[PDB]
Design a protein around this nucleic acid. Structure first.
Lengths: 132, 62, 22, 99, 82, 135, 213
RNA sequence: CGCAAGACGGACCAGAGCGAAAGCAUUUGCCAAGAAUGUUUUCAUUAAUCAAGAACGAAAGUCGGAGGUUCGAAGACGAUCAGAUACCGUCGUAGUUCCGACCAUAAACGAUGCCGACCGGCGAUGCGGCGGCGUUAUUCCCAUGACCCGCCGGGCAGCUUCCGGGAAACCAAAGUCUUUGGGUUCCGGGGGGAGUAUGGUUGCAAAGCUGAAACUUAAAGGAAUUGACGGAAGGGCACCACC
């Protein structure tokens, strides 16, 4: 019987997502940031919010939490998004192409390309899961 | 009625309409061949080394 | 009453009628 | 109103189907309608495998199996919990349970 | 597909359709000329022959009747007319 | 006078397990089956007709039959178990597994296991009516 | 008071020579007294013994019914009275998306034994088949059954009991039936499911002892 | 371990096939049939539905004759119960089996007449035909079987879609309907009385077909919704519940 009520969860997530720089692994920091901006008027509530921010910090070192968004994690993810590989994946020297798509390319006036490699197709013609 | 230091690596939990019966899967320490599942009353925690007193007549059902 | 058993009662009644005017 | 499109039976494109007797109450139910279960079980229960095998003359006998096909009526299946009532949306699901 | 030129259909699609369902019905059957190694006169045979037609100069048959196309016999070369 | 069992060899018998739902028959015979050696049922132990099929009655019957067979020379047994069969239930009663395990635990050597349930090729009419047992 | 087993003797019944193992078990018979002789109540006994107990390495799901014919030197002599598969063996191959061909033949050996042979076969799903069912059409079933019947007739009517049982031990009849019916419809688990003795020639000790040759 | 009698064709057996429907499951042979497919055959409107009329028509029932295992209407007991005259158990007659003659009724149902046209998709499956890499047996190319990938035509169906319809449930027909007319048969007109009476007719009989009215009534009914209830199921909780 220790399920954190939505009051605690919302307050803790808002506090963490907003002023994570001031928030480490403690309680008085949370009570201070409360009494500064969004003051909470009780004591057991402040203890439970400190406990939930502690738990969320324990779960946030291993990875980004679903309900929170720091500038740090968003920054890391946008740097990963902006990643430009040195060599393109589509820049292959040789591309394997089946005879049917080869004929299709020939019909598109693209049969004179030299970067293709006609690959022998499947010997058999079975591709379905046995019914049952 | 074998006697050995049974290495328990499988304790699933309690079941029964009186709720004191835990199902312990007694496994032998260095056998890795046979195991017994028993309904026994009392706290038998995960990882403990049971005293082997009997290796048949498993937890009865129905 | 069940429709089948109602019909059975009507048929028994008809049998009695057949009997009385033999 | 029509509870089932197939009328609760597999009869389709024919007129009559031979009946079979329920294996629990001996009730005549059409073969396509009866709920069919197939039990391929070990002759000895999983508990008794060790004591039979340890007292078996042969080395690695490999124990036989009881194969029984049971035919139930609807009522006996509901009582035996072989199947149960389902929601109108989920009644149409012919997929066997994953088990 | 809400716009299909039924006047001029694809030849592949008309070859696909039933012999009657086509724009103008045409049979899937044809007539062949069969040549035997030892005979020098041509013999026209229906593709879907219903009878065991024999060659007058050879002891072998030209085709076996079947449920559909007749079963031509090896050793006779067929050439479809038209 | 008696059997000619060797020092290491074991003589065999055939055990018929009639596992009905009213009581369990534990029967032992020669390999042929023509000579009955000793047969103790589930109703020979308990006087509760509910208990005649229960696994404990099967345990008692199998242990009795094992003791009698051992005192009569037989050491190993072949297993040929049956249900009621016929048009009635094709499944062993509650005492088949118990009787077999009690025979195994009594120091017996189990041989081959077979089912001898009478399985008709659609034989005569089942006992129940058209609507069956409505209770 | 007096248990009947104090008036009972033990005999060691034996199998014919075509089986690798000779001693197949013992048997209890009461001692001779009155008009009753210890042998007339012992001749009519049938032992349903697995093949693996009569061959050093063979199938355990094949059972042979051997019937005593006389008792020489406290040894009961048995001959082939039947052949079966175990109940679980038969039940383990009747699947629900294939057709089962059940042929049978009344045939006679060259020595006078009349045997009814039952052969069972099951159609085989191909290793690349997608279709769920592997049924055979009725004409195909008839062709397969006719091939089974003629194979059984040609494999029993040309032989006598000794060689018939000799070829029954590895069930070469089933292998021949499978290879013959492969051209019609591939079959999966083909065996001579049963062999029963309808009528047998007159009792003679000479052929009996010649079997144990 | 044998013998005999009668029954019934388990598993394979399927939302598979056939049949006008009722219905049809061991083999083999014979007899006559039949759909579909294939057809650059033949006739050439010979067609569709269908009063009168006719053939067939589960089970039970009737009569006559064989048979009679099992099951089992009635019935006799034994239990349960307040009482059961029932459900349950042990028996047990007619019947349940075959032949001949009746009967012509079923929730005889897809509760959905038949013929015809048109109007989406997809994956299967039974039959036939056609085409095509490849594997496999016939110890040989090609045939042909067994598979694999498609195409066509009928068939039993299935999923999906606001095609459209419908009171909706649902229906690819129960759509193409106030934008109402392709052809044709049967049939309903608020609920009861009542499928009753009576007449006719059929039948050995049971009964079948046709079939009212007086009188009585403001509703009866269909589909769906919410709640309540369930000696319905699945989860959860409570010493004002239990252990």
């Amino acid at each position: 019987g220790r399920v954190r009520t939505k009051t605690v969860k919302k307050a803790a997530r808002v506090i963490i997502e907003k002023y994570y720089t001031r928030l480490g692994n403690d309680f008085h920091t949370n009570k201070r940031v409360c009494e500064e901006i969004a003051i909470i008027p009780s004591k057991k509530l402040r203890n439970k919010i400190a406990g939930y921010v502690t738990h969320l910090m324990k779960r946030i070192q291993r990875g980004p939490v679903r309900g929170i968004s720091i500038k740090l994690q968003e920054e890391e993810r946008e740097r990963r998004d902006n990643y430009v590989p040195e060599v393109s994946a589509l820049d292959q020297e040789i591309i394997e192409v089946d005879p049917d798509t080869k004929e299709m390319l020939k019909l598109l006036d693209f049969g004179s390309l030299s970067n293709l490699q006609v690959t022998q197709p499947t010997v058999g013609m079975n591709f379905k899961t046995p019914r049952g | 009625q074998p006697i050995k230091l049974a290495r328990v690596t499988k304790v699933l939990g309690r079941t029964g309409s009186q709720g004191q019966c835990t199902q312990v899967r007694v496994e032998f320490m260095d056998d890795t061949s046979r195991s017994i599942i028993r309904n026994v009353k009392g706290p038998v925690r995960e990882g403990d080394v049971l005293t082997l007193l009997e290796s048949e007549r498993e937890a009865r059902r129905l | 009453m069940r429709a089948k058993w109602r019909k059975k009662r009507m048929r028994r009644l008809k049998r009695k009628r057949r009997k009385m005017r033999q | 109103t029509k509870k089932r499109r197939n009328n609760g039976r597999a009869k389709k494109g024919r007129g009559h189907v031979q009946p079979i007797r329920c294996t629990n109450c001996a009730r005549c139910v059409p073969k396509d309608k009866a709920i069919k279960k197939f039990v391929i079980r070990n002759i000895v229960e999983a508990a008794a495998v060790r004591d039979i095998s340890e007292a078996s003359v042969f080395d690695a006998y490999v124990l036989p199996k009881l194969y029984v096909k049971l035919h139930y009526c609807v009522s006996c299946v509901i009582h035996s919990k072989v199947v149960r009532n389902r929601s109108r949306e989920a009644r149409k699901d012919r997929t066997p349970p994953p088990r | 597909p809400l716009a299909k030129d039924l006047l001029h259909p694809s030849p592949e699609e008309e070859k696909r359709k039933h012999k009657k369902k086509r724009l103008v019905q045409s049979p899937n059957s044809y007539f062949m000329d069969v040549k035997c190694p030892g005979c020098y006169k041509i013999t026209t045979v229906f593709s879907h022959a219903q009878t065991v037609v024999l060659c007058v100069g050879c002891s072998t048959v030209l085709c076996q009747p079947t449920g559909g196309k007749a079963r031509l016999t090896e050793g006779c070369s067929f050439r479809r007319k038209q | 006078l008696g059997p000619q069992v060797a020092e290491g060899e074991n003589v065999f018998g055939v055990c018929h397990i009639f596992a009905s739902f009213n009581d369990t028959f534990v029967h032992v015979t020669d390999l042929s089956g023509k000579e009955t050696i000793c047969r103790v049922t589930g109703g020979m132990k308990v006087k509760a007709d509910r208990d005649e099929s229960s696994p404990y009655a099967a345990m008692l019957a199998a242990q009795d039959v094992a003791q009698r067979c051992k005192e009569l020379g037989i050491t190993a047994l072949h297993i040929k178990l049956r249900a009621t069969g016929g048009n009635r239930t094709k499944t062993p009663g509650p005492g088949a597994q118990s009787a077999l395990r009690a025979l195994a635990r009594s120091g017996m050597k189990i041989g081959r296991i077979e089912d001898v349930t009478p399985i008709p090729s659609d034989s005569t009419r089942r006992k129940g009516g058209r609507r069956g047992r409505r209770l | 008071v007096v248990d009947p087993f104090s008036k009972k003797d033990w005999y060691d019944v034996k199998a014919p020579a075509m089986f690798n193992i000779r001693n197949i078990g013992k048997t209890l018979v009461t001692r001779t007294q009155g008009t009753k002789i210890a042998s007339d109540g012992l001749k009519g006994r049938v032992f349903e013994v697995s093949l693996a107990d009569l061959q050093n390495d063979e199938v355990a799901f094949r059972k042979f019914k051997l019937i005593t014919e006389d008792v020489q030197g406290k040894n009961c002599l048995t001959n082939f009275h039947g052949m079966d598969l175990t109940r679980d063996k038969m039940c383990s191959m009747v699947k629900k998306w294939q057709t089962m061909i059940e042929a049978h033949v009344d045939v006679k050996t060259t020595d006078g034994y009349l045997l009814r042979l039952f052969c069972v076969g099951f159609t085989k799903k191909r290793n690349n088949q997608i279709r769920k069912t592997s049924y055979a059409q009725h004409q195909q079933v008839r062709q397969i059954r006719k091939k089974m019947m003629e194979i059984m007739t040609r494999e029993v009517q040309t032989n006598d009991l000794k060689e018939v049982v000799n070829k029954l031990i590895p069930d070469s009849i089933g292998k021949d039936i499978e290879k013959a019916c492969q051209s019609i419809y591939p079959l999966h688990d083909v065996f001579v499911r049963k062999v029963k003795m309808l009528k047998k020639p007159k009792f003679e000790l000479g052929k009996l002892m010649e079997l144990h040759g």
